[PDB]
Amino acid sequence: SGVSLGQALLILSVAALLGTTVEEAVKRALWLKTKLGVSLEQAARTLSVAAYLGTTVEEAVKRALKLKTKLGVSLEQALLILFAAAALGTTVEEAVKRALKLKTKLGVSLEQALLILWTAVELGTTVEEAVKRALKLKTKLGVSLGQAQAILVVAAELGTTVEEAVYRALKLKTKLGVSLGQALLILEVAAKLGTTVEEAVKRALKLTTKLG
């Protein structure tokens, strides 16, 4: 029970994505988190997958649950599938094949594999090249693969070099005393909101009750 800064930022991003007020975004998210008994993050993510698919939230969930039972995955994983497949513009079976192809090939989570696939979409590169870049960062900065891919996409959303992205991220981790995760989040949210980092955070803090 409580809103970590992280959750708050995401919800901002959702509010943005839906194009609703952040009061209504958070109302919907907290309503979904209880109705489904998921994390708040997962509730926001579900809102964002439904939007991404151009569907209603029930419809998305109904579909996820047909993939949860059919493939024996977790709900979130089912949502990720749907999202990945959308992004690609393929079928779920194809998406699922490619992801379990990356999962085995690289020794990662299914979730990681999907996200790699989605990063590739955004970067406009091959999945081989995306993994390349992510492994380059992982090593260069001693960061996790997740971080690496995150940085990549954030660098993309900003329309800046990965170097400059890191600079600003690190600069926000020093200036504000956040983790790298948080900084990246903040950067992307602010870019999606079309505001400063300071504005985005102040907005996030209005929702933050827990201490991330």
Author numbering: -1 to 210
Sentences from the study reporting this entry:
Here we address these limitations by introducing an artificial metathase—an artificial metalloenzyme designed for ring-closing metathesis—for whole-cell biocatalysis. Our approach integrates a tailored metal cofactor into a hyper-stable, de novo-designed protein. From the catalyst perspective, we sought to address this challenge by designing a derivative of the Hoveyda–Grubbs catalyst (hereafter Ru1) that contains a polar motif, aimed at interacting via H-bonds with the protein, as well as improving the cofactor solubility in aqueous media.
The evolved metathase Ru1·R5 maintained nearly half of its activity at pH 6.0 (versus pH 4.2), whereas Ru1·R0 lost nearly ninety percent of its activity. The X-ray structure of Ru1·R5-ΔHis displays close structural similarity to Ru1·R0-ΔHis, with a backbone ΔHis of 0.6 Å and a Ru atom deviation of 1.0 Å between the two structures. Notably, compared with Ru1·R0-ΔHis, the evolved variant Ru1·R5-ΔHis features an expanded and less hydrophilic channel leading to the active site, which results from the three critical E4G, E144G and E179G mutations. These probably contribute to the increased affinity of dnTRP_R5-ΔHis (versus dnTRP_R0-ΔHis) and hinder the approach of hydrophilic species (including GSH, OH− and so on) that lead to cofactor inhibition. In developing a computational model of Ru1·R5-ΔHis, the structure was predicted using AlphaFold2 and further refined using Rosetta FastRelax in the presence of Ru1. Yet, the resulting models did not accurately reflect the deeper placement of the Ru1 cofactor as observed in the crystal structure. In contrast to the free cofactor Ru1, the dnTRP-ΔHis host protein protects the thiophilic Ru1 cofactor from poisoning by GSH: at [GSH] = 1.28 mM, Ru1·R5-ΔHis maintains > 20% of its RCM activity, whereas Ru1 is completely inactivated at [GSH] ≥ 40 μM. Guided by the X-ray structure of Ru1·R5-ΔHis, we selected four residues (L8, L113, A148 and L183) located in the proximity of the ruthenium for randomization with 17 amino acid residues (except Cys and Pro).
